[PDB]
């Protein structure tokens, strides 16, 4: 037995993320979880 | 522009290849259903003969 809704929708064979997706640079770099003061040297400058 | 076009065309090719097999399986399933119906007709004829 096969229902039309069940027959029509099957698991997609393969999936990939869209080439242009909005990326949240604001949230990613501006906000930092929990540290008031950081080690003197963490990034070379 | 031309690259986006070419990639879309390749995807079109794959999609057409998929659709042809879809049609094949659909016709095969229809054939199976008709076979079942004819078998049932044969059985009913046998019942009538009995």
């Amino acid at each position: 037995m096969m229902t039309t809704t069940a027959l029509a929708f099957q698991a997609p064979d393969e999936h990939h993320k869209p080439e242009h997706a909005r990326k949240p640079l604001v949230r990613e770099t501006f906000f930092r979880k929990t540290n008031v003061f950081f080690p003197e040297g963490c990034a070379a400058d | 522009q031309m690259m986006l076009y070419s990639k879309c065309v390749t995807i079109r090719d794959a999609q057409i290849e998929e659709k042809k097999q879809m049609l094949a399986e659909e016709e095969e399933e229809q054939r199976r259903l008709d076979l079942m119906m004819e078998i049932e007709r044969v059985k009913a004829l046998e019942q009538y003969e009995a």
Partner: protein, 426 residues
């Protein structure tokens, strides 16, 4: 979830129900031993509509048998799919009605209806959410019509919010089984026009004409006629039991088909009904099914749709079909034969599609038409009623039991205003 209880009255209703439960048990895949042996799990999901799970995966039917002579019970239990009922549900008298409506409505009812009301009660609160009641009977017999009518009265007095299906055959002069047919038919419908919410009118001679022209059977016994009626009943209730692209429950069909509270006598039909010799020479399409649907020779009542107008109609399809084909097919039938349909109601067709065809077919359809042509049937029985009432023949067996003459006057008056309002809306 939704629940339909089954009530079988009289010999005809009992044997029809026997075939009906054989069909349903086949479509759900349970053996006459009461055990599930189907393969799809689509069957299991909606058997609570008709069955009670019992220990060992056994599903007993939610049915109640009701009669007055044990021979009917023997005929039920002799045939297969007979050992699956509950012996507590075999509520049953001892004497017999004998085709007397007063005996079925006043004498033996007074001591048997309490017991059937108790068992239909217990069977109602055994489930959670009722959908409706489903009673199979006749209109001429004694133990079926009279007791069934009084039963419908008590149940409608009890549960006024649930649907009600009455599969009732009607008599004709050409198929004249008993002599007091109008005396029983008139009173039964005179009570059904206020109690029952909708009634499927049936007749023997139209079934006879079906098995002879379309089926081309040589010896059409009662088994095949009852097989047809079971097919219609399984079709009308397939929507609850199986998922579809457009679902239509009992109340949904009711509000689509009943435009006025008294106009609820429907004619029914089933397709495909095709002779085995010609089954190889035909096609299986929506146009193929529809041309057989709207055939005048496929109504299961001897009421010519060409002699009246359709108020409304419905079509319940089963199988993988294209809904567009369904819509444009019904639009055609309305566009071509526009004179027969009623004008002040646009779009006189309700349609629905379920995904599961019955076993043995690929596509099926159940047609339900509420036309005004049945007034010809009612005047056809009312004329016999008035003719017999003009000289009170066969009346005293009804008078001496408790019924009086004004009951007959009210019945014929109600019949008269019914055919008058049918004539009015035509």
């Amino acid at each position: 979830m939704r629940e339909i209880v089954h009530i079988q009255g009289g010999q005809c209703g009992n044997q029809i129900g026997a075939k009906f439960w054989e069909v349903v048990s086949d479509e759900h895949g349970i053996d006459p031993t009461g055990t599930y042996h189907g393969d799809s799990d689509l069957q299991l999901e909606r058997i609570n509509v008709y069955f009670n799970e019992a220990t060992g995966g056994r599903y007993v039917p939610r049915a109640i048998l009701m009669d007055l002579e044990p021979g009917t019970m023997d005929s039920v239990r002799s045939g297969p799919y007979g050992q699956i009922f509950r012996p507590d549900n075999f509520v049953f008298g001892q004497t017999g009605a004998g085709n007397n409506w007063a005996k079925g409505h006043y004498t033996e009812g007074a001591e048997l209806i309490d017991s059937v009301l108790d068992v239909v009660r217990k069977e109602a609160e055994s489930c959670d959410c009722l959908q409706g009641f489903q009673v199979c009977h006749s209109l001429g017999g004694g133990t079926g019509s009279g007791m069934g009518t009084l039963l419908i009265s008590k149940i409608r007095e009890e549960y006024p919010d649930r649907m009600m299906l009455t599969f009732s055959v009607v008599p004709s002069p050409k198929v004249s089984d008993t002599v007091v047919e109008p005396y029983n038919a008139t009173l039964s419908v005179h009570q059904l026009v206020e109690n029952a919410d909708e009634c499927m009118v049936l007749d023997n001679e139209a079934l006879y004409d079906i098995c002879f022209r379309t089926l081309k059977l040589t010896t059409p016994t009662f088994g095949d006629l009852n097989h047809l009626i079971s097919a219609v009943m399984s079709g009308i209730t397939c929507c609850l039991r199986f998922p579809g692209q457009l679902n239509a429950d009992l109340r949904k069909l009711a509000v689509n088909l009943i435009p006025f509270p008294r106009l609820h006598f429907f004619m029914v039909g089933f397709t495909p009904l095709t002779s085995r010799g010609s089954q190889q020479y035909r096609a299986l399409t929506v146009p193929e099914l529809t041309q057989q649907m709207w055939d005048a020779k496929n109504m299961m009542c001897a009421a010519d749709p060409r002699h009246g107008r359709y108020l409304t109609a419905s079509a319940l399809f089963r199988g993988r079909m294209s809904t567009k084909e369904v819509d444009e097919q019904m639009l055609n039938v309305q566009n071509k034969n526009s004179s027969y349909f009623v004008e002040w109601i646009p779009n006189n067709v309700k349609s629905s599609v379920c995904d599961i065809p019955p076993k043995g077919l690929k596509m099926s359809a159940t047609f339900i038409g509420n036309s005004t042509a049945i007034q010809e049937m009612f005047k056809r029985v009312s004329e016999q009623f008035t003719a017999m009432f003009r000289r009170k023949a066969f009346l005293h067996w009804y008078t001496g039991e408790g019924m009086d003459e004004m009951e007959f006057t009210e019945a014929e008056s109600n019949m008269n205003d019914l055919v008058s309002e049918y004539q009015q809306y035509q």
